[PDB]
Design a protein around this ligand. Structure first.
Ligand SMILES: [Br-]
Ligand SMILES: [Br-]
Ligand SMILES: [Br-]
Ligand SMILES: [Br-]
Ligand SMILES: [Br-]
Ligand code: NI
Ligand SMILES: [Zn+2]
Length: 195
């Protein structure tokens, strides 16, 4: 059951939000989330995530395992073209919207997305109007942000991306699985590569 796996995932995401003060500071968890009955859409990333979801902390393991169990049931998205990121990146990365205007659960109060990148990928400079708050669920990666330090983030660490500030991320030997909140002007916009 897709419905059961996604409902269990939503519970794990809510618990994760409640447990992270930076997430509580960024947005209140919505009281109106509704099952959307959005169908699954498979992309090649599923098998990479399932075989190699990344090291979890004891605190992040329930969410990581819920994400792996949800993988065959979510609507995976890519966003970028082969010209922009290359075929290997498209094979070994993807994202989906867990909650939000077009989430597996609908709400207009918040947007929650999830991304996976296998090892050895360089997600180049990209940007968008809405603010975003990353968390790492499992794995680790190096996070770049214009006008700010580089940070190597591990499970449970977070990073705020202010509106329109370009950011980027590199995985080295480990993959990374993330769960991200969005807010502000432009909510519902997708990232674009910086020009
Ligand atoms: Br809550
Ligand atoms: Br909920
Ligand atoms: Br509304
Ligand atoms: Br800073
Ligand atoms: Br707002
Ligand atoms: Ni398709
Ligand atoms: Zn972003």
């Amino acid at each position: 059951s897709g419905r059961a796996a996604l409902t269990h995932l939503l519970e794990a995401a809510r618990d994760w939000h409640e447990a992270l003060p930076e997430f509580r500071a960024f947005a209140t968890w919505p009281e109106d989330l509704r099952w959307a009955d959005r169908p699954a859409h498979a992309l090649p990333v599923i098998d990479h995530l399932t075989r190699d979801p990344g090291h979890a902390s004891d605190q992040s393991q329930p969410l990581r395992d819920a994400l792996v169990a949800a993988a065959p049931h979510v609507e995976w998205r890519h966003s970028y073209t082969e010209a922009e990121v290359g075929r290997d990146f498209l094979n070994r990365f993807g994202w989906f919207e867990l909650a939000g205007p077009s989430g597996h659960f609908l709400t207009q109060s918040l947007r929650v997305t999830v991304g996976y990148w296998g090892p050895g990928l360089d997600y180049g400079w990209h940007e968008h109007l809405p603010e975003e708050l990353y968390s790492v669920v499992s794995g680790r990666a190096l996070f770049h942000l214009r006008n700010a330090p580089d940070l190597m983030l591990e499970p449970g660490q977070t990073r705020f991306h202010p509106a329109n500030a370009p950011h980027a991320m590199t995985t080295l030997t480990d993959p990374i699985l993330t769960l991200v909140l969005w807010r502000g002007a432009g909510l519902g916009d997708d990232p674009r590569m910086s020009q």
